[PDB]
């Protein structure tokens, strides 16, 4: 229904250039999700669209959790759209932890939401914190997917670097598949220097 790519493009959330990503791969694009989430009206509309997919799955989500900082707004709007509670994990002494008095009930059905899933590494660190507290991780969610992890309802395949488990669904609005080059085989490196975004 919502034109996802046009939303991100109009918001100037799509940076074109030469970037060294967290996976070690070089790309001609980078996504700045904060440029979309800056607008609560856009964030709500995207979260309502995401919730439709989640509800079709009948997973009985009781709580949405996000790893701080970037995943916070997306997960929070998703929790509002689902009519459930929202909690977040944060890095304390360089390790993911659940603070702020947030508590998890034993076997609480939690969806781990991010603003964007690249490798799914931060989402996995968040899920491990919750599982150790007795929670059941039933799904992963994101507004945008980088085509590294496979999302539900897509004909794309999971790639090298994917960290999310194969037995749990990932729900995302769209796949933002960019050129991914190995650093020793990057065509952009011939013309410019790759910078960390
Ligand atoms: Zn390069």
From Swiss-Prot:
GO BP, one annotated term: pyrimidine nucleobase biosynthetic process
Annotated orotate binding sites: 118, 146
Annotated keywords: Glycosyltransferase, Magnesium, Pyrimidine biosynthesis, Transferase
Reaction(s) catalysed by this chain's protein: orotidine 5'-phosphate + diphosphate = orotate + 5-phospho-alpha-D-ribose 1-diphosphate
Pathway stated in the Swiss-Prot or TrEMBL entry: Pyrimidine metabolism; UMP biosynthesis via de novo pathway; UMP from orotate: step 1/2
Matches recorded under CDD domains: PRTases_typeI
MF annotations from Gene Ontology: magnesium ion binding; orotate phosphoribosyltransferase activity
Pfam family name, one: Pribosyltran
The EC number(s) this enzyme carries: 2.4.2.10
Family according to the record: Belongs to the purine/pyrimidine phosphoribosyltransferase family. PyrE subfamily.
NCBIfam families registered for this protein in UniProt: pyrE_Therm
Subunit field text: Homodimer.
Functional description taken from the UniProt entry: Catalyzes the transfer of a ribosyl phosphate group from 5-phosphoribose 1-diphosphate to orotate, leading to the formation of orotidine monophosphate (OMP).
Protein name per Swiss-Prot or TrEMBL: Orotate phosphoribosyltransferase
């Amino acid at each position: 229904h919502m034109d996802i790519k046009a939303c991100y493009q109009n918001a100037k959330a799509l940076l074109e250039g030469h970037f060294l990503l967290s996976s070690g791969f070089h790309s001609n694009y980078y996504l700045q999700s904060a440029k979309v989430l800056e607008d609560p009206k856009l964030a709500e509309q995207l979260a309502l669209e995401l919730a439709k997919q989640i509800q079709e799955a009948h997973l009985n989500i009781e709580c949405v959790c996000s790893p701080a900082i970037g995943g916070i707004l997306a997960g929070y709007e998703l929790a509002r759209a689902l009519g459930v509670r929202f909690i977040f994990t944060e890095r304390v002494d360089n390790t993911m932890a659940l603070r702020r008095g947030f508590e998890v009930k034993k076997n609480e059905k939690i969806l781990v939401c991010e603003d964007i899933i690249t490798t799914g590494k931060s989402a996995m660190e968040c899920a491990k914190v919750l599982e150790e507290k007795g929670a059941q991780i039933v799904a992963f969610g994101a507004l945008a997917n980088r085509g590294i992890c496979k999302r539900a309802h897509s004909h794309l395949k999971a790639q090298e670097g994917a960290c999310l488990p194969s037995h749990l669904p990932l729900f995302a609005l769209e796949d933002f598949v960019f050129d991914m080059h190995k650093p020793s085989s990057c065509p952009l490196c011939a013309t410019s220097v790759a910078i960390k975004p």
